[model samples]
Target: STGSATTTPIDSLDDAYITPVQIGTPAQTLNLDFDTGSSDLWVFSSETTASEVDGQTIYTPSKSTTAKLLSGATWSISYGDGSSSSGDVYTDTVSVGGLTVTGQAVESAKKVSSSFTEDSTIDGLLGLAFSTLNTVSPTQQKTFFDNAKASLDSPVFTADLGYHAPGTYNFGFIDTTAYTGSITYTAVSTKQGFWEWTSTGYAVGSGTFKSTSIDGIADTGTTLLYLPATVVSAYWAQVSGAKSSSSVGGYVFPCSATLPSFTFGVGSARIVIPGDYIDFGPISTGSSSCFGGIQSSAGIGINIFGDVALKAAFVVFNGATTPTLGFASK
Candidate 1:
């Protein structure tokens, strides 16, 4: 089941990235968030409340001959940012790139929370997390990766999350041409249903590396890089005039301020996050106020290495008996 798909950032092409996939018998394409944070393939569907649906596209299963209703099955999900969606379940044919998957669970949303409804672009989510995290009731479902891995030439997938550019998500085979240098490997703890790992240490700006030993999850759904408050605070201090903005939220700074480089350790390999990548984007039209992509994970317990951190490197999600995450220079 060798499959590959191109991923592109939405609208402004900044923050989030999405891929296209076809679902059901007749085949309707949907632009979905290829998320690793959770495991559930959910879509905006005809069942979605009329008022709750906005500028997004909806999938109609009734038109598909292979679409089957899962009796008494339902799904509900809530992301770290408080975005939530709920719906009924169906079993249907699903395809990614050129590989086809049969009996794939499709969660057709009937109601969505503000986060999903207000967003004009994303039509659904294609989860790559462990199957255990699937939100389906009555019976759990396998992820598109899990279902298709058996037939893969090599049971592996690669994520080339671009830095404000076009990227790719490849399955079955690793395109060696996608990265540079040797792939740095580290074992992950899947006990929590995530590609979870720990950084041996971190350095803010040109400061000497500290053995911070931060625990975190490699999440593609999230856009910013999240860390403990102490780590986040340390990074902020290096920037001139960087401070917490109660009105704007998180850490904001002057657009003219120079951001220092950051390095976090993954075993012996040190992955560097350049100063420019740390500065997410401007908060206002005038560009005087800017928001830093690195934020505090104080309340959320688990630190997240989102797009800001991912765009810096190429990642390999190896689904073995003991899962691991491999990083390489892009």
Candidate 2:
């Protein structure tokens, strides 16, 4: 079966993409961030302490007859700052758009970090990464896509992310109309449990494309573009007032400075990110300095082609036995 769901940016910076999902028999709807960087479909739940939750929606398992606790199952994942969320597991009927999985593993949060408690725009995350990355222990569980792929028409999913507007996530079939030009297919390495691939090279503004191989993952969960120090510095060099600020954490530049567009190659196909997308936003309230959307991935270990990059192209996540990723201009 095919399914189509709308994914909207939760904030002006496109911090995260939120998609409505249905869980259990009565269909409790929750706005979840569809993160491709990690695995584990988790949510704020009745088990979560009131102090740990803010205005976010909670998934009450007891409210649905289809919900069944997975005996002795639990999951935990930590953030970059050591903050973490841990919870118990339950299998429930989960649906995205109209695609239904009768027994999808749903982790209910018992405790969450302060970062999660402060941000109430998202109830939780719907992980689309490989099941191997799932945090569930003892008895691992399959991701929504993994469990639903068998019934899908072609075992594929596509992401059509927007700049500041709403986009779509389609399951089973590719919506030809969602992209422009022919798609460029690339082999994906799931050994690292991510949709990892290498780009032919990149260019800053109208600069020539460097024929270097840059490996990275297409992560929708992340808000910015992170590349090697060399590549990141080159991009910021073109901006008139750009500078690396330790206090601000990354590159920041005068808001009035002219920003240059960024382009990366995918199998000879070029996907360009508009200059405005790199502007990010002001560093502080009423500040004239804006944080750059592109930053150094040196400390991050692996490069991340996050939302800033993904929103510039149409992305296809092929779940075939021999998996591959597809990119097309939009």
Candidate 3:
């Protein structure tokens, strides 16, 4: 039976990273960043120019006997960070752990940036987040999950970041052992791939800011939680001794004192954001410091709850069973 669960939606950051499942055997491996914000699993290719593919891992099709390129299908993706890549469509036998899925959709990048090209440790990206954000085209539309769904034992997938690096993302199979209580499934709105919703209200520490309501989406690709100006200012006020500081991008805060834990009231459910995550990554401006997870995005008009907020809990993206998401406590 499905368990009763709750979700906490925050603002978006820019840390949508994931690793690639190796193709064929253990010998050929491609580590990549998986994004739900966009569809299409793309990797730098051997044919890509050395200058263009500097820090990225380029998968050599010649290394595998089962690799095949999709003729006439060209692909290009531009990220909000200004990083862009263009490539051709291809198919291969992709494997994660012991699970083998065939006809896996993969992108072979012909052109990329140095930051992306030079990362020899990372192969490419696996986008399993949502279909609304899929990068696949209508003519050549296909995703890794689209093909692997039939082969999955439960038709459900779980992303475990605890085992991997700080931004490490995992996929396939939702483990039932993580939840202490029940898992509740929420119906997804008919909006695009973005998980947009209206917050009934918000709270900083123990103080409830009823007037500071907002609408936003839940994205795993981002790293921090973005909130509106009213909530941001009101939240900082509750953090007893938080000092303001300025970082490269914006202002942040640092507090040695036990800052209050923040929770958003989403209907009958309550989602909590740990204090450690809030204090650790604070941005500084000269002498003033602000909350690390909560940044000021005055006119952005949207909030994003990235990985920082996500790592604190277990999330189940159920696109297979229904158009909804299941949140459970870790």
Candidate 4:
């Protein structure tokens, strides 16, 4: 008995929005990007001109009543941090939040850059994560949990990230009063849409770094928590001497101490990371200290528990019933 409540308004630190969907059989409203890191659901069309599109939100299959266009199959993608796009391929009638599923498979870039043309408000990106990072494969990806998973009452998909601040990235389905039922399920590891784990040590303020097994990756499109370099130099040497301000790239530290309280042990499950996310600040003015959430990628192979450690808990991916992955709390 809980379904129907929408809100969007986030500013810095990558706040996401643009809900509304409907693309075929007489229903064409488009707006996406509910992205949980990566799980494709692209948009931007009208055959795109203005230099191959930028800051997208196009979608003009003749002003829709239901749009369709997937003739020669021409799609393009490039990310790892280079960001690229190109498009073609369509099958419409897609809807979200209000739920309306019908032949939904999308991607219509028509060329894009400028970080996907500078965010253009919101109207593309509904990748709820896992589905093998879907790009319309597995015989044409039909996500949004394969079209609302039979009217979701609880097949679960919960993600309340900045809830309503920091970077507001909410979604639907699980609202078990937000959470606190004590969840810890994890089993998604077939590869792609990454969510691995291994940490058994780390604790700042009072200082504790025992057991340390580290190998995490829970990225919500990453915005912090890179870690590794001896765990960010032993968490800034327990942050009392603090000192490591090259400007804002060494994970900033000189906020003048008092920031300490970090934990991440998964196996018995014990996650806690708060100290204003480790003095996060300074990505400018000489740039060298920006640890609002720990950093130091090192060789950047992996170790991203970003979105500031999922804002401290309450996640749930569960691709319907298999590729499992869960967490709890509101």
Candidate 5:
């Protein structure tokens, strides 16, 4: 039997999802962002600067008898959004869902950027990417999933994230009842430390499907769907009052405008992003405009199939020898 947990979406508009995790002795629970983009289980801690801590819950290693310092070693990470964190390392008992990993290298953040403090929701990030992407300097740490996989019935996890609702993340098991239809599987190039795959093409609205190719990563940490500039242009071209805006840093349109459903081709399988998901949220407070979720990954160097597109289906993060992605309609 495998372990399972409910992933709760924090923001009212579905900005991110947090999975309840327990660390150290007596289980100091923390809501951590389950990120597939990077590998490292970091947490806010007593080591953090008090003034910079803000409203986050901190993990006190001193109270945990099982905790030990990873002497003379450290870790630091910076995201594409410029959010960063750095701290020394400690080995402690870490558990998620119901499984446990002893002596897991947990990064205790002594420093954090405004991006982390501002959210004030998730205590830290639990990386699900390949351990090769770990940020620890001297010793690269394995994720809970990796350490626990040998003990699991199967080396797999299923992500059933839903739109503006609590969803379940199952480890070592797949819930057939969560999704409809058979899963369409794709090969992943884990050499890049991401669930990377190429799409055959895309289609917008009710138009003819265009034949192109896209190499994008599946990143739950990212909020929007990133695509090529030309593809973005063709998408908003169908929506009225939609235009690229520097003020909001992406495409924006009137709140009343109807949106088009975007679809991506995976070989013979096509996955669609409903229009409602494309309307991210208001550009800002008191703004009658919304930001477009699908944007140009022009400068990012790679495309990402973020939450906007992921919530539309059930995803299997399979870790077989070649690694693979299995998607099914929700």
Candidate 6:
């Protein structure tokens, strides 16, 4: 069986990509951020503190005939962005597009950080990373993808994230028309519970490609591209007025400065992120200074090929015995 869903950016800056998901028997629909960086299908729910609800939608298990509370289960999560949440667990009939899973573990948030509370556009997160990353305690719970893979014709799913438009996510089948040319396949290391892969090299604008191996994870949850300090510095140096600022906490430049495109290699294929995409957005509303979409991974330890890089290409997560990741130009 196969399923399809549309993912859309919450704001002009492409802060996060949200997809509609249905939970419970009566199908309480909520917009959830589909994060490939982590594993936990959590949501705002009736069990959440009333003060933390804000303007976001909540899932009321009491209203669903198919909902069943997991007596001793619990979960907690802390993200790299400093946001966190913790709650109890419940098994419910959850659906994504046309794919339905019975007794899927739905984490019900009892507490949440301010960052998540302020962002009303996103009710919670739907993690797509390896199930090993799941935060449930006592007995680990399977992710929606893991539970559905058994019935899927092929144990694979694809992410087609857009810049400011709607993109498609397909399960079990690859949409040949969604991408151009053949996909370049590469081995994936899931030991860390992430879709980690190594890039052949990179190029800034029209410059020659640098032949170096950069290991990183493809994370849809993250907002920007993070590479080694050497790579980030090289790219920013090409910008006329770019500067690494401690005050602003990243590379910033005049909004009018002409930004250079970034290109990364996958096997023999090279995916190019346009100059405009690297501009990110203004440092503040109506500010002339703009933050870069590519930054250093010095503090992060591992490089991250986030939305800034993924939005430029089509990605496939193949859950074969020997798992592999595939990239193609859109």
lDDT of 2 by residue, 1-330 (tens): 989999999988898889999999899999998988888899999999899999999999999999999999999998543567989999999999899999899999999999889989999988899999999998889999999999999999999999999999999999999999999999899999999999999999999999899999999888899999999999999988899999999999998988999999998899999999887889998999999999999888899999999999999999999989999999
Q: Write the per-residue lDDT of candidate 4 for residues 195-242, one digit (tens) a residue.
A: 565566676656654676777767665656777777777777766555
The window of 10 residues in a row where model 3 has the poorest summed lDDT is 1-10
Question: In candidate 5, what are the lDDT values of residues 122-174, reduced to their tens digit?
Answer: 89999888888898988788887788788777888888888889998888888
How far is 17's C-alpha from truth in model 4 (Å)? 19
- TM-scores for all candidates? 0.97, 0.99, 0.79, 0.34, 0.97, 0.99
lDDT of each: 0.89, 0.93, 0.59, 0.62, 0.88, 0.93
Error of 3 at 306 (Å): 0.9
Runs in model 3 with CA error above 4 Å? 1-20, 24-27, 114-121, 136-138, 163-173, 197-199, 209-214, 240-247, 255-258, 280-291, 297-301
lDDT of 4: 0.62
RMSD of 5: 1.1
List model 6 lDDT by residue over 142-230, tens digit each.
88999999989899999999988899888899999999999999989998999999999999999999989999999999999999999
Better of 1 and 3 by TM-score: 1
Candidate 6 pairs with clashing backbones: none
Candidate 1 RMSD computed on C-alpha atoms after optimal superposition onto the true structure: 1.3
Please state every model's RMSD to the true fold in angstroms: 1.3, 0.9, 5.4, 15.0, 1.1, 0.8
